[PDB]
Amino acid sequence: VLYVGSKTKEGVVHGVATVAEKTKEQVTNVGGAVVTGVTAVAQKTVEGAGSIAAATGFVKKDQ
Amino acid sequence: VLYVGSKTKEGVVHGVATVAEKTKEQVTNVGGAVVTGVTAVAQKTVEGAGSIAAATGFVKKDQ
Amino acid sequence: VLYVGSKTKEGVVHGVATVAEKTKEQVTNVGGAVVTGVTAVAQKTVEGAGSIAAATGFVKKDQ
Amino acid sequence: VLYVGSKTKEGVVHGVATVAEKTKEQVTNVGGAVVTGVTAVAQKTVEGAGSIAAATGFVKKDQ
Amino acid sequence: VLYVGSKTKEGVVHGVATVAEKTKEQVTNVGGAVVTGVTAVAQKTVEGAGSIAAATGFVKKDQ
Amino acid sequence: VLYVGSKTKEGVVHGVATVAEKTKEQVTNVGGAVVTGVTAVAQKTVEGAGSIAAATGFVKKDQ
């Protein structure tokens, strides 16, 4: 491959405006992955799993 | 590969404005991964798992 | 590979403005990973796991 | 005009997020009023005409 | 006009986030008023006309 | 006009975040008023016209 005078944007996030107001939030997490709120994310991944919330573990919550 | 006079943006996050106001938040985490609030993230990962919240552990919460 | 006169941005975060106001936050973490507040992060990772909140441990919270 | 235990907002502007990017702007003003960009304004009492763009006055442009 | 135990906001501007980026701006002003960029303003009482751009006055531009 | 146990905000500007980046700006002013960049202003009482850009006065630009 070759590149000559040639721009290249990969995994880019731009121009994001937000206004949260009187938000109420309650999270109860047990061995999981939780993502909340405002979240701009630009994730280039190579030879590997790209994720915002990954839950791979073991949870025993018996009764 | 070769590059000549050639810009290249990878995993870039720009231009982010936010206004949180009278937000209330409660988190109860037990062995997990929690991410909240405002969160600009630019994550180039190579030969490895890219994630904002990863939960891989063991949790025993019996009763 | 070669590079001639050629800019290269990887894992870059820029231009972030935020205003938090009268925010209330309560966290109860037991053996996990919690990230809150305003969080600009530029994470280039190589041959390793890139994450903002990683929870890999063991938690025993029996009753 | 009494007030007892009573919150009161008069003339308020809050919670504003904006993102300009690669904007180009050219102004040629001759004896006028020009206002550009982001503009929060709050005025409780005003003893006149309220207006965003008010053009009184004389312009002579003969040829 | 009594006030008892009573909060009161008059003429207030809060919570403002902005991001300009690669902006280009050219102004040619001749005897006028130009206002650009970010502009929070708060005025409780004003004994006149309230306005963002007010153009009174005389302009003679003959040819 | 009595006040008893009573908070009061009049003419206030708070909580402002801004980010300019690679901005280019050119002004040619001849006998006018130019205001650029970030501009928080707070005035309780004003005995006149309240305005962001006010252009009174005479401009003669014959040819």
Swiss-Prot record, chains A, B, C, D, E, F:
Region ranges (4 X 11 AA tandem repeats of [EGS]-K-T-K-[EQ]-[GQ]-V-X(4)): 1-31
Impact when changing residue 3 to F: No effect on osmotic stress-induced phosphorylation
Post-translational modification comment from the UniProt entry: Phosphorylated, predominantly on serine residues. Phosphorylation by CK1 appears to occur on residues distinct from the residue phosphorylated by other kinases. Hallmark lesions of neurodegenerative synucleinopathies contain alpha-synuclein that is modified by nitration of tyrosine residues and possibly by dityrosine cross-linking to generated stable oligomers.
Tissue-wise expression: Highly expressed in presynaptic terminals in the central nervous system. Expressed principally in brain.
Binding-site residues, Cu cation: 14
Localisation per UniProt entry: Cytoplasm; Membrane; Nucleus; Synapse
Sites of Phosphoserine modification: 51
Superkingdom, taxonomy of origin: Eukaryota
Sequence repeats: 6-20, 21-31
Its job: Neuronal protein that plays several roles in synaptic activity such as regulation of synaptic vesicle trafficking and subsequent neurotransmitter release. Participates as a monomer in synaptic vesicle exocytosis by enhancing vesicle priming, fusion and dilation of exocytotic fusion pores. Mechanistically, acts by increasing local Ca(2+) release from microdomains which is essential for the enhancement of ATP-induced exocytosis.
Domains (record comment): The 'non A-beta component of Alzheimer disease amyloid plaque' domain (NAC domain) is involved in fibrils formation. The middle hydrophobic region forms the core of the filaments. The C-terminus may regulate aggregation and determine the diameter of the filaments.
Family: Belongs to the synuclein family.
Disease: Genetic alterations of SNCA resulting in aberrant polymerization into fibrils, are associated with several neurodegenerative diseases (synucleinopathies). SNCA fibrillar aggregates represent the major non A-beta component of Alzheimer disease amyloid plaque, and a major component of Lewy body inclusions. They are also found within Lewy body (LB)-like intraneuronal inclusions, glial inclusions and axonal spheroids in neurodegeneration with brain iron accumulation type 1.
Subunit field text: Soluble monomer. Homotetramer. A dynamic intracellular population of tetramers and monomers coexists normally and the tetramer plays an essential role in maintaining homeostasis. Interacts with UCHL1. Interacts with phospholipase D and histones. Interacts (via N-terminus) with synphilin-1/SNCAIP; this interaction promotes formation of SNCA inclusions in the cytoplasm. Interacts with CALM1. Interacts with STXBP1; this interaction controls SNCA self-replicating aggregation. Interacts with SNARE components VAMP2 and SNAP25; these interactions allows SNARE complex assembly and integrity.
Name of the molecule in the record: Alpha-synuclein
Residues of the whole record sequence present: 37 to 99 of 140
